[PDB]
């Protein structure tokens, strides 16, 4: 490898400004650059760096073919449902983890940066669906989930309910009712020659 290809845009994933809600999860593939992971385990702001897969110490000795960073804003104690195989209101009709999700998951802490005195009403989450989502899949089609057998041509009423409900965020204690931020780094195994190794000599 040459001296340095380019600094990875990976810092922007952690310290960007605007994030997407859980219903529309956003992704970003990291292109060819020298891996910069030494600044992760040394930071004290991280408190949920628990992840199953490769060792959390031999990060500079890895050459995964391609890496993705996925971001969402699931709130509070709902984070723990992200694990190698779980079910629930979040990992049923939203972000789902397979048994081969090699990589790691990172959680943040919420503050006045993502909050409002009046409240937040621009954040949505899926609550009604008809089947479990396949891993790493999204379903964006929101008219009616047809709870009843009556026609649901688009009239709000009995047996025809909306499938999306807005989050409600207010300044509170914050144990499990704050807009936490969760990102997932996902690695691939082998489809192309390795490009993101991080040696220097």
């Amino acid at each position, epitope marked *: 490898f040459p001296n340095i290809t380019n600094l990875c845009p990976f810092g922007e994933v952690f310290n960007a400004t605007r994030f997407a809600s859980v219903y529309a999860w956003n992704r970003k593939r990291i292109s060819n650059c020298v891996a910069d992971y030494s600044v992760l385990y040394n930071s004290a702001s991280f408190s949920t760096f628990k992840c199953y897969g490769v060792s959390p110490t031999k990060l500079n000795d890895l050459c995964f073919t391609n890496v993705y960073a996925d971001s969402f804003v699931i709130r509070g104690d709902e984070v723990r449902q992200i694990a190698p195989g779980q079910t629930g209101k979040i990992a049923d009709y939203n972000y789902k983890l397979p048994d081969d999700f090699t990589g790691c998951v990172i959680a943040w802490n919420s503050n006045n940066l993502d909050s409002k005195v009046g409240g937040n009403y621009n954040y949505l989450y899926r609550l009604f669906r008809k089947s479990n989502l396949k891993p790493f899949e999204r379903d964006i089609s929101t008219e009616i989930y047809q709870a009843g057998s009556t026609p649901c041509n688009g009239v709000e009423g009995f047996n025809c309910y909306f499938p999306l409900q807005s989050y*409600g965020f207010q300044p509170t204690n914050g144990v499990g009712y704050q807009p936490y931020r969760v990102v997932v780094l996902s690695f691939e195994l082998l489809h192309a020659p390795a490009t993101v190794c991080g040696p220097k000599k």
Partner: single-chain antibody
Amino acid sequence: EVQLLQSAGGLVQPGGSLRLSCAASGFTVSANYMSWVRQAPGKGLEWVSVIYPGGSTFYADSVKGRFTISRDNSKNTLYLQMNSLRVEDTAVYYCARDLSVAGAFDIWGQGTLVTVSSIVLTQSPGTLSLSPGERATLSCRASQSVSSSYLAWYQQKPGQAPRLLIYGASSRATGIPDRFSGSGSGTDFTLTISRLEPEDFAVYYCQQYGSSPYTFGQGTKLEIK
């Protein structure tokens, strides 16, 4: 005309096997949340089980593993198999659909009775015996201080099934008269009935959702001095 019929009124031998049944009357069970709750006579209500669309199963904290709830779309049933049953498990086993965010337990079943061998939520006021012609105040406090709209209210009736009064502490359910009001925020909520009517003397409960296993209040009965 949604109806939920049940048939479980049978005495059970010690360590016996029973099978309850909840049917449907127009709405498919494969597209909506379902829940089984325990009445626990002599005390407040409590939670038993929840089935999501899909078919993931959530059980209460007191009981682990032994409860076996099953869903049958072929006959449109919400079966629950009671295995070997121990002491202090005699209560009613209501079943109801769940729309927690938008309307909490709008329609319930009818109830049953199973015999035996041979978040900190509290509600303050109490009986508060009064007379018709004025209003009243019912206060429901909480220890966790749920933020905005995850608390609802229910009304009991002797021999009947629980009904819905207000969902999310902001708007009442359909068919509710305009004499019921609710307010409050932060830690406690207040509910008021104006122009008391003879068809209003009933026990009121406050329930919390959108959190750890759902909890109801102990019970506030209204009586005439």
